[PDB]
């Protein structure tokens, strides 16, 4: 920091409620401000739209050295810096940045941090230099020149419990959030669609608007609509929050196998006599934490640890259970390969961070134990790594895409995957849970049940030509090695939540 | 109230904690006290163990008229009045009732209000007459001379909920209380068994003991034991409360068909992998309020009202559901009758307060609707009224006794009864709930399941010779009229809770 060099500080006064701290900008590396110095009614040539960049810790630019000529000077700052400021300042009026604000062109494309930030105009009023004996600073207070729309759609936290009301352990709240969300300006049309900023942490949408604007914003979500009347609520530097149908709420639910699972992540009791078919994407088929490093923590030699647990790494919040798709089709899995996915995998740098898809040649578990483990999510990630290398369009990827297209998985889940042979075998028990707990629900929300006499694909590999395939009796599932990749068997997809 | 007649008031100072108000006696109609008047070191012949009886509002006896001779007189009172008080008072010592207390014989037979009250010795100290100008009163403060043991065994309130944790409506708390309760003095033997007073309102046992007594009291309950060391805790006019294994506690439970039901009224989730067989008496087979005036409140002509609802009248707290017995046997129901129970019933004064047992000749409901109603509890009470009149030992009463002997029903339930044909038909649905929800539980706690091909007795009468009998397919129950009372069919008992 140059001797006699003026230090720059920038503070956002924040966007406050039209009716707390409000929305205060903290700034980030790369943000730029412009600085002006006005002396005796004229901008100083040396400090005329001078840019300063935030590096994550402080504001840097060309040093401004203190001089006695800076006594009585009015300093002004604005964000975001504009290369062209000709005619954007006013020396006569009482608002130096009045033309910048008047001509500020705001669009409805604000869906990412950069698209929003570049439109969030902030300015200071006349600021004095503080200091003496070579230690000087400029500390600006910035105010937002636009207005802000905040939308809070309805959401539901589920506290999943056992039959005694004891909450199951989790990493973060499980929240069902609105789906098929679209916002429109004044009327619903493809050309009037607007793109607000989605705050995933607060679960709310934000949109900068010109002060005194009066448009209706139409929101579509789930299967309904709302009208957000912004007229008279668009004050400069202030926000209006629209809470739609109660906003956030919390419920408790005894999570059980057979419960109905929906596109927004909501769950309905499997005892429901008339379940809604709309947006139903599957049935809860297993309750508990399905991470292999949790399930198999006490297995001899600890073959599953946090280091090689892809599910724990990619979706640490999915500790409640598994869902089976209403989706079902018959088809091929992949072409017959020269080199198995297992054999390819063992030649890569991924052997410490993933588990092989093989049920048969695993280095840590024998061919009796490995096909019984819950590893479908792992297997999907290993198959994605294989795809990234060879770009072979396996038929299983097309069925996965089709399941996702017809029954979109919630963003809070793993997404759909072909279950491992272990996950499929666990669908059946000695009390015929497949027919009694699953098919009795499937028939209420779908025209297809899980045929107990059918053969099901797993994502567990036998060799270069075969997958493990699962069959059932009325008392057990059985993982067999005869699943020739080019044969036709039945698909059911799973997701973790 | 006689002019110049002294008014008597009696107040118990109460039994207080050895370590609130404590246990304060309020007195009841028929209670008697004895009164003494001591003048110049001698008992007055006119007021020597004079009895006074409480009538529910006031104390009455032979009137005591005020006289100047009563100035300076010491009055004493004790409870309960004894016809013989010779040598039971002390004029020399500072405690007038010291010999009464010293010779007081206390037994361990205190199981009813009268057996307890007759042993609860209470006395006053010297009391002065209050008043002037013909208005006088004697207001005694009585203190308990014995000590008191209070035992609080463990109990569990169940707040039964649906899958969303919403409490089901109820009239009073549902509480599982200890069973097979027995107390013994010093050691366990048939001859050392003691009978304390059971306070059903507070769910606790009380036993008067001599002050400074030191016996261990051994309590047996459920399948365990406790030792109550009374040594050093038996102070005159004070109680010691022993809280066994935490005493009263509250839990919440999602009540479902298939849940395991126990002898103490406790319920275990039907999802339990290893249910306890010990004290299991049945399976929850229906959830909800089973009172016919509630279930059928909207039926045309309102055939079921509070006036003719025997279940609501006798067990108003049984609004949670029904349980089916683990018990099952085959046998006859009754002899063939000349006059049906229905035909007998219609000639009685009970036709407005009960529903007929007939499924076929009901005056308000036709023969298609009447056999589908839940009326087994009603039917048991009508059959008891028939037994009270004719004293015929029907075989169904012997099977009921046998079920109760092997699987005792909790005191908070209806007790076991033969289900109506309507209750049996509701055990099966289109998703084969009989085999999937009931038999899968029965096989874990019993060696017998409900055979879907068997024929079951109901308590619904067809005519003088036949009962309705229920058969099942994999999709429905069917109530048939071919149940000749002297034929052999299968019994399953139900209870309401
Ligand atoms: Cl920010
Ligand atoms: Cl909210
Ligand atoms: Cl089979
Ligand atoms: Cl297997
Ligand atoms: Cl009392
Ligand atoms: Cl307690
Ligand atoms: Cl059938
Ligand atoms: Cl029928």
mmCIF file with all atom_site columns, C-alpha atoms in Angstrom, chain A residues 163-165 252-254 256 267-269 271 430-431 436-437 440 443-444, chain B residues 163-165 252-254 256 267-269 271 430-431 436-437 440 443-444:
data_model
loop_
_atom_site.group_PDB
_atom_site.id
_atom_site.type_symbol
_atom_site.label_atom_id
_atom_site.label_alt_id
_atom_site.label_comp_id
_atom_site.label_asym_id
_atom_site.label_entity_id
_atom_site.label_seq_id
_atom_site.pdbx_PDB_ins_code
_atom_site.Cartn_x
_atom_site.Cartn_y
_atom_site.Cartn_z
_atom_site.occupancy
_atom_site.B_iso_or_equiv
_atom_site.pdbx_formal_charge
_atom_site.auth_seq_id
_atom_site.auth_comp_id
_atom_site.auth_asym_id
_atom_site.auth_atom_id
_atom_site.pdbx_PDB_model_num
ATOM 1  C CA . UNK A 1 163 ? -43.745 -45.174 13.912 1.00 0.00 ? 163 UNK A CA 1
ATOM 2  C CA . UNK A 1 164 ? -42.888 -43.712 17.355 1.00 0.00 ? 164 UNK A CA 1
ATOM 3  C CA . UNK A 1 165 ? -42.380 -40.201 15.990 1.00 0.00 ? 165 UNK A CA 1
ATOM 4  C CA . UNK A 1 252 ? -43.989 -34.621 10.131 1.00 0.00 ? 252 UNK A CA 1
ATOM 5  C CA . UNK A 1 253 ? -44.448 -37.928 8.369  1.00 0.00 ? 253 UNK A CA 1
ATOM 6  C CA . UNK A 1 254 ? -44.004 -41.610 9.275  1.00 0.00 ? 254 UNK A CA 1
ATOM 7  C CA . UNK A 1 256 ? -42.786 -46.238 5.110  1.00 0.00 ? 256 UNK A CA 1
ATOM 8  C CA . UNK A 1 267 ? -44.602 -37.991 0.100  1.00 0.00 ? 267 UNK A CA 1
ATOM 9  C CA . UNK A 1 268 ? -48.119 -39.314 0.669  1.00 0.00 ? 268 UNK A CA 1
ATOM 10 C CA . UNK A 1 269 ? -49.030 -42.157 3.061  1.00 0.00 ? 269 UNK A CA 1
ATOM 11 C CA . UNK A 1 271 ? -52.501 -46.014 3.264  1.00 0.00 ? 271 UNK A CA 1
ATOM 12 C CA . UNK A 1 430 ? -40.405 -63.918 2.901  1.00 0.00 ? 430 UNK A CA 1
ATOM 13 C CA . UNK A 1 431 ? -43.811 -62.146 3.379  1.00 0.00 ? 431 UNK A CA 1
ATOM 14 C CA . UNK A 1 436 ? -48.251 -56.858 -0.859 1.00 0.00 ? 436 UNK A CA 1
ATOM 15 C CA . UNK A 1 437 ? -46.353 -53.550 -0.263 1.00 0.00 ? 437 UNK A CA 1
ATOM 16 C CA . UNK A 1 440 ? -50.867 -52.768 -4.221 1.00 0.00 ? 440 UNK A CA 1
ATOM 17 C CA . UNK A 1 443 ? -51.925 -50.324 -9.364 1.00 0.00 ? 443 UNK A CA 1
ATOM 18 C CA . UNK A 1 444 ? -53.524 -47.167 -7.766 1.00 0.00 ? 444 UNK A CA 1
ATOM 19 C CA . UNK B 2 163 ? -49.041 -41.057 9.483  1.00 0.00 ? 163 UNK B CA 1
ATOM 20 C CA . UNK B 2 164 ? -48.792 -37.231 9.633  1.00 0.00 ? 164 UNK B CA 1
ATOM 21 C CA . UNK B 2 165 ? -48.552 -37.168 13.426 1.00 0.00 ? 165 UNK B CA 1
ATOM 22 C CA . UNK B 2 252 ? -46.592 -41.070 20.425 1.00 0.00 ? 252 UNK B CA 1
ATOM 23 C CA . UNK B 2 253 ? -47.412 -43.874 18.034 1.00 0.00 ? 253 UNK B CA 1
ATOM 24 C CA . UNK B 2 254 ? -48.682 -44.144 14.444 1.00 0.00 ? 254 UNK B CA 1
ATOM 25 C CA . UNK B 2 256 ? -51.902 -49.085 12.109 1.00 0.00 ? 256 UNK B CA 1
ATOM 26 C CA . UNK B 2 267 ? -48.845 -51.402 21.147 1.00 0.00 ? 267 UNK B CA 1
ATOM 27 C CA . UNK B 2 268 ? -45.793 -52.301 19.069 1.00 0.00 ? 268 UNK B CA 1
ATOM 28 C CA . UNK B 2 269 ? -45.274 -51.329 15.406 1.00 0.00 ? 269 UNK B CA 1
ATOM 29 C CA . UNK B 2 271 ? -43.039 -53.378 11.190 1.00 0.00 ? 271 UNK B CA 1
ATOM 30 C CA . UNK B 2 430 ? -59.477 -56.228 -2.546 1.00 0.00 ? 430 UNK B CA 1
ATOM 31 C CA . UNK B 2 431 ? -55.685 -56.161 -1.775 1.00 0.00 ? 431 UNK B CA 1
ATOM 32 C CA . UNK B 2 436 ? -50.834 -59.482 3.799  1.00 0.00 ? 436 UNK B CA 1
ATOM 33 C CA . UNK B 2 437 ? -51.590 -57.330 6.913  1.00 0.00 ? 437 UNK B CA 1
ATOM 34 C CA . UNK B 2 440 ? -47.868 -61.900 8.298  1.00 0.00 ? 440 UNK B CA 1
ATOM 35 C CA . UNK B 2 443 ? -47.164 -66.032 12.293 1.00 0.00 ? 443 UNK B CA 1
ATOM 36 C CA . UNK B 2 444 ? -44.479 -63.998 14.222 1.00 0.00 ? 444 UNK B CA 1
#
